Design a protein around this ligand. Sequence first.
Ligand SMILES: O=C(CCC1CCCCC1)Nc1cc(NS(=O)(=O)c2cccs2)cc(-c2csc(=O)[nH]2)c1
Length: 125
Amino acid sequence: MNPPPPETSNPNKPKRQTNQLQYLLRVVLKTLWKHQFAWPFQQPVDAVKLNLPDYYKIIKTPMDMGTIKKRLENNYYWNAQECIQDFNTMFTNCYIYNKPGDDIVLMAEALEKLFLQKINELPTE
Ligand SMILES: O=C(CCC1CCCCC1)Nc1cc(NS(=O)(=O)c2cccs2)cc(-c2csc(=O)[nH]2)c1
């Protein structure tokens, strides 16, 4: 069973655009998206499709790059750190749901390294 995907809009929450957020979409996300190991992370985990009936029994704060992309496109975030936290939640979810050495974990590990490389330096405000 699948819960609703994470919100990509919220009228109670203030919107913002910054140079760093623009960069997170244009450069960081859109480059990671093209990586050979990006595909498991491009949409919310579908526990019915993927036959992971316990996915959402284990993962209580799901996150994926499809959601992050939409949030960035919608100016959902206040700042870059908020967006960066979503990427980190996505990676840690993978390490939590699986186990060390798994192919899926090797994929997340490679993506996380590339992610860190790209956010090491962000544009100035
Ligand atoms: O995301 C997908 C498919 C996305 C999509 C890709 C393009 C077209 C068809 C489906 N599969 C998938 C399978 C699987 N199960 S798997 O055995 O096929 C697998 C093992 C190593 C990589 S995927 C897991 C996960 C997963 C994402 S986060 C997490 O912790 N797990 C994802």
